[PDB]
Design a protein around this ligand. Sequence first.
Ligand SMILES: C[C@H](CCCC(C)(C)O)[C@@H]1CCCC[C@H]2/C(=C/C=C3C[C@@H](O)C[C@H](O)C3)CCC[C@@]21C
Ligand SMILES: C[C@H](CCCC(C)(C)O)[C@@H]1CCCC[C@H]2/C(=C/C=C3C[C@@H](O)C[C@H](O)C3)CCC[C@@]21C
Lengths: 9, 9, 239, 239
Amino acid sequence: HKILHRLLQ
Amino acid sequence: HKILHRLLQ
Amino acid sequence: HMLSDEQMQIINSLVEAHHKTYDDSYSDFVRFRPPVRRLSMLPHLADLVSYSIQKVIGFAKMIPGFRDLTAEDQIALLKSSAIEIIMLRSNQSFSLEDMSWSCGGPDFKYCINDVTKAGHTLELLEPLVKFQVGLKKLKLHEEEHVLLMAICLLSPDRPGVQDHVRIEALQDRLCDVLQAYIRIQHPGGRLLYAKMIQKLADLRSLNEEHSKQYRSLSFQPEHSMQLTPLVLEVFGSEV
Amino acid sequence: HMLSDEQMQIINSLVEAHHKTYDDSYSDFVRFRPPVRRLSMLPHLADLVSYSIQKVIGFAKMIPGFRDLTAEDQIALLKSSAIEIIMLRSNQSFSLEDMSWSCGGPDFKYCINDVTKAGHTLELLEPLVKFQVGLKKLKLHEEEHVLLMAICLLSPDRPGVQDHVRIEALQDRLCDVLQAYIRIQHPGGRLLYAKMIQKLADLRSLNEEHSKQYRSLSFQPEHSMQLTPLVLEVFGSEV
Ligand SMILES: C[C@H](CCCC(C)(C)O)[C@@H]1CCCC[C@H]2/C(=C/C=C3C[C@@H](O)C[C@H](O)C3)CCC[C@@]21C
Ligand SMILES: C[C@H](CCCC(C)(C)O)[C@@H]1CCCC[C@H]2/C(=C/C=C3C[C@@H](O)C[C@H](O)C3)CCC[C@@]21C
């Protein structure tokens, strides 16, 4: 979930 | 390596 | 009767958040991989979906109370609902006059033959367009469309969620706003709240069919290599 | 002295394979995500690299004897050598007159400021271009350029390989062809075989610097999401 997690700031 | 493997037919 | 201050700000917040994450000019579509008309449309449509996922996450982070759930539930609600929110938001571009999504010129006018050129069968396309013409006929105000999106995202019946209580509470505060809004600012629709909740069940079924066809695609490596990293993360099983 | 029949067919096979996988018109570049001139060039250049990886795999599958290695060694040789073959093949588009790669018009003319707009520092760019002008000055025939690519791919000093004997044998049959070719069909270069083998060491060092900077990029999720699935597979650790 790397990207999704960062995209949720 | 799913894609690389298929790309080597 | 009336809306309270808190139901006001929730409407204000969801409408602003939608305007910040939906561009009616579709001008970023010129940054995608171009369309081609063997699955020729798949790179452009993968880019489009991937762009839209970034937008729904933005909407999501601005839904009052969403930011308060744990990171797990936010990811859990986003992975399973994104395709449904994308189908909802895409109603803003769906024209009855041609049954296509008209995001610009002949380039970004997506008809039914372009969806099939992205590796999707009529089993998905046939109820998807019927959902679009059914949704379009409702002639929803801006506030109802945006309330429907947030209610959809906040369904507690999604795989992964753990705060069944906290997210079921937000989704009900949101339905309370939508039910109030229709009472105050929408005559000519006593069953409008029922036909909308109806659409949420329609989406559950469209979500299933799309995720079945995606699963097949994501195991054909020559096709999964056409997707983006975001698409592969959001629609792939990763718990 | 002369080339044998077998050294002939190996030259014939590698030159045909290169013509099948290198398009001097760069016409598929209009299918990439367009360039932008915050890392604006990264989507276009990721697409370009990803396209080039598909091409090197094609070249690889047509190198006589490569198809005979196990699938593991083919993957092992391709994952660690691809960036080097891409740097080699990109010499065909590198112009001395402007120190850029000129793949078409002002759109696909990649200068030094565009490489940095793809998140790569001068530590990579400074020896990379010096490798390009050093390689360009060699004025290699078609056969030598293609023999150099195959020799590079077939280095037994790569992580993952298991048939140290079988791939070290192919790489030496290939050097024997290249050494013979220069003897027969290339006067004005007694050290040409030595300066070429020199370039293979130059690439080892460029490969290190690029894979260091890529590693940093692939852990910044906002950047890794700009890459393609092929790029992430070829350049990521997956044993
Ligand atoms: C078939 C294909 C997905 C294939 C890609 C994978 C492999 C991931 O399935 C779509 C099916 C349903 C979701 C959104 C659909 C549409 C959205 C339109 C929008 C334009 C504007 O309204 C802004 C919106 O955010 C998106 C209409 C065209 C069809 C798709 C893209
Ligand atoms: C910096 C960037 C990679 C950034 C993307 C990640 C994140 C994966 O590092 C490249 C660095 C060195 C490899 C090839 C370079 C070039 C190749 C040119 C070719 C055109 C034609 O000759 C056909 C060839 O196959 C490719 C010149 C421009 C720079 C790149 C693309």
